[PDB]
């Protein structure tokens, strides 16, 4: 039988949890923030403007990170399929190469996904910190 690339399988095993963690914290923080939004009033909305800008950020981070979750199943599916064609068409060497190209790419992604998750925590912490006053008390 043709097995999964173990070196990667273990990395996926450490990554998946990290992904689950960001998406959940990112959801708490967002809720906390929304719950901070004051009654819609006619004047004095700078603080409101500030919450809206931080919010934009949280929202992109989410969008970005939500994808990671599914890119993992696609790997096994894309790979499973390559191995199958490679097998059914043993004369076609490109399928053999495809499988290895998939592994290399999944490897280069895991590194990038870990990199982009660290960066989310960093950037989030940073922005919530700088503007805490208005995020918490938009009006005073």
């Amino acid at each position: 039988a043709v097995n999964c690339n173990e070196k990667i399988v273990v990395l996926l095993q450490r990554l998946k949890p990290e992904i689950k963690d960001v998406i959940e914290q990112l959801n708490l923080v967002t809720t906390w923030l929304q719950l901070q939004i004051p009654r819609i009033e006619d004047g004095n909305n700078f603080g409101v403007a500030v919450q809206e800008k931080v919010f934009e950020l949280m929202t992109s981070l989410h969008t970005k990170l939500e994808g990671f979750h599914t890119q993992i199943s696609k790997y096994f599916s894309e790979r499973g399929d390559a191995v199958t064609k490679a097998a059914k068409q043993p004369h076609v060497g490109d399928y053999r190469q495809l499988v290895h190209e998939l592994d290399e790419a999944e490897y280069r992604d895991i590194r990038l996904m870990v990199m982009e998750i660290r960066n989310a925590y960093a950037v989030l912490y940073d922005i919530i910190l700088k503007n805490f006053e208005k995020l918490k008390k938009p009006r005073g």
């Binding site: 043709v2 990667i8 592994d103 490897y107």
Partner: protein, 60 residues
């Protein structure tokens, strides 16, 4: 609008829990995760010059 005392209480409780979880996220979890992941990256697993070392068998 009439929000019963016990119903408002259910909400008050959620809102407090969330504030707490959040003070903790900012003051500790986030600085912690930034350090953990930063280490993971500097680790050998996530640092292979030769990706042909990553190469897995395909016996066909």
């Amino acid at each position: 609008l009439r929000v019963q005392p016990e119903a408002q209480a259910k909400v008050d409780v959620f809102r407090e829990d969330l504030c707490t979880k959040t003070e903790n996220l900012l003051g500790s979890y986030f600085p912690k995760k930034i350090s953990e992941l930063d280490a993971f990256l500097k680790e050998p697993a996530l640092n292979e010059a030769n990706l042909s070392n990553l190469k897995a068998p395909l016996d066909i």
